[PDB]
Amino acid sequence: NGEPIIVPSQDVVLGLYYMTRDCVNAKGEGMVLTGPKEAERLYRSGLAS
Amino acid sequence: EIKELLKLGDLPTSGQIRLYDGRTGEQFERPVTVGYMYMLKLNHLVDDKM
């Protein structure tokens, strides 16, 4: 069937689910960011989960 | 009895310790189950399979 078989399987899937899920009041909720690079900078600095 | 043994041995009673990442120094965001498992070594050796 015309569906991709080169697909993430179980470990990439667990990692991406844990990435794009959202908590309620985790760490640094309700800021405003200049973009994706500043979001990655915030996480790897440790000021936001 | 397992949790009573863990509380005797001065360990976390949930079984999981806070593992730090040895590669980058940071702490893992969730507690990770650590403990001793009796690992075997089977007779399927890659020197004999290759």
Next chain:
Amino acid sequence: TEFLKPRLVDIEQVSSTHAKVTLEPLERGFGHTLGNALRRILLSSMPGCAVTEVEIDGVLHEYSTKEGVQEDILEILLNLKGLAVRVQGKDEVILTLNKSGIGPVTAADITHDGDVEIVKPQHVICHLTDENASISMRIKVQRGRGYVPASTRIHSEEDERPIGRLLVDACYSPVERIAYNVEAARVEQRTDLDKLVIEMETNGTIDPEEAIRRAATILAEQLEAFVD
């Protein structure tokens, strides 16, 4: 007992503020150490100047609004945080901006001191709908290091500022994103070595090679005490 000194073989400059500083070969388990040390120092310890405090007339808080503008006061603060400024001599410069008419107000409109200049004059800040719209701000340019958000800024400060003084975050460090990739290199004897590939993208005021050089200088100066 002598180690393996690396040799810089590639600086693939993708853009004017991008770099791929490939550095091979290192000892087994040293690329991760050098990459993580440089990443932590560049993210939270490199000094620089940034917009910290802004006073805009007509608004009282970040949840308010303004007439005669396309975007809101939140996007105005976001575009003001995204500005890249350099201050040479002092560490607290107050800057003004007054613009009236139809047109996108940019960073080339604001006043500049002798040691205060802007490296992106085409940086769009806001827009105006009305011909009679007069947008006014007083932009305080501080100087610090690392990154301090407005949440911990208002939780650390205690003085009662006049209401209408807007708190914006501080992008003190000039590097926008650095991400190292440790590959595996090969000398003919030792195949178990590695290779450090640092992908660094910064804003203005600093070139990426000078950023990595200043980070290594900072780490060497911190380690300077207990050497041979």
Next chain:
Amino acid sequence: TEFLKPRLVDIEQVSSTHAKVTLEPLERGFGHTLGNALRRILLSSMPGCAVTEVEIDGVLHEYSTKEGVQEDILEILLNLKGLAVRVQGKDEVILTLNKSGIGPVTAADITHDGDVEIVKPQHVICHLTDENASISMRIKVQRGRGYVPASTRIHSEEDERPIGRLLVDACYSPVERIAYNVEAARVEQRTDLDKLVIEMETNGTIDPEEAIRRAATILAEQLEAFVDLR
């Protein structure tokens, strides 16, 4: 530029092997960085001395059994791989262990030279049982870093190897366990300074202050190529 510099302040040895060593003061965001970098360097690349060749008399291969001893010769080679020693002057010495009679063959019975100091005089190697039993090995201690196995050594040995040299694997690094701590440093005018408490645990051979200074020397030597060439 408002940086401060760290210094070795207190070095307290709780045991002869375990030795906690502090570092003070460090700026905010440098304790974890310097602690992780020094931990990785001290676990990876600490030079030490370890047993590399063992030549027991009257013994051809490791899988033989000598008459008189209780332990198998493979167990003797494992107990000799577990030996801890500190060569002061040279880089390649040869020890000698002669012992007869009934009793255990401890590590203190090794006839050491003038510049070879054994750090653990209770490391039991053998268990002699017969009254007429005797053992005369010629232990060889090299100097290096890392883990060099017997397969790598017989691959890098282009010269001949005689019959009798029971080739022991080499674990050169004397640091077995190390963990740092980033506490709150006590400085009279700054409350945003963090001290580093490195709780080392060595083999008893290396000096902890020499280990930290050698680790910082290795790190500064590696960062010289980052300072100089772009």
